[PDB]
Design a protein around this ligand. Structure first.
Ligand code: ZN
Ligand code: ZN
Lengths: 155, 158
């Protein structure tokens, strides 16, 4: 069944492109043998650069589950997750990920997937989008608030 | 009142503290600035929105794009209370603001119990050996989406 679900993700990626929804990426999230949510890249039609197929599928699955974690779920994606989506997977915590195409296939199609992976390893200020650290005396204050917030929900 | 980077970062830190104390979510805040003014603010809201992608930076990016009616953050600067985790660093690169300023570091988030540092380390592990394993499966049709894209005349690049 892993192949079946991955084939569905690839079909969704093609359909997304051909219907003008977005980019060539699709994803499916499964739990207990049932698809709980699907996603297609929809960045340009939703004015949301975070609306990658995997992110969209994660958001929709979490809404169906009424949860912020993907306990016992498997994510199937048409292409290896980019850094944003790999991060989203680690915050959502499904049990496994299956993918077909690789980041190099996305890069060959003109996308920044590979470039972003490489930017992570560059020194912060030399990144194409520079990242500057600034010292603030109260930079740990949010963490102190968190420690003292009795009704917190960990994530 | 002259503004500087520290002033926008302090607003991000205030948003992080107030987001925790109002029960919105985690100890992280962010603001997006354009033309010297804040155009969107974000607070981590993962557990109240049932959305593990709702980090402060992602929320601020989403809101700013809605304000601008765009999917890019042309000429914007992002200020965040803590160094972006891998998800948010990726979101920044897909949104394309000009620069990012941050106060606390990934090590501070890790010391407070968050997975920020862990995820950066996981990127470098072989896919199948990751704590959340990533399995590549060969499908004959794996390039079909990209062929569709190359042939879709009205595509909008991003
Ligand atoms: Zn992605
Ligand atoms: Zn983040």
């Amino acid at each position: 069944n892993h192949e079946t679900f991955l084939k569905r993700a690839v079909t969704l990626a093609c359909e997304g492109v051909n219907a003008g929804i977005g980019g060539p990426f699709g994803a499916v999230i499964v739990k207990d043998g049932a698809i709980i949510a699907e996603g297609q890249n929809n960045v340009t039609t939703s004015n949301d650069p975070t609306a990658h197929a995997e992110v969209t599928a994660i958001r929709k699955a979490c809404k169906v589950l009424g949860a912020y974690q993907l306990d016992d779920c498997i994510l199937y994606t048409s292409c290896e997750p980019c850094p944003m989506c790999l991060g989203a997977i680690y915050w959502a915590r499904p049990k496994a990920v299956f993918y077909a195409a690789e980041h190099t296939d996305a890069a060959e199609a003109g996308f920044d997937d590979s470039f972003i992976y490489k930017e992570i390893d560059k020194p912060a200020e030399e990144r194409t989008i520079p990242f500057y650290q600034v010292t603030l005396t109260e930079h740990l204050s949010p963490f102190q608030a968190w420690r003292n917030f009795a009704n917190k929900k960990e994530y």
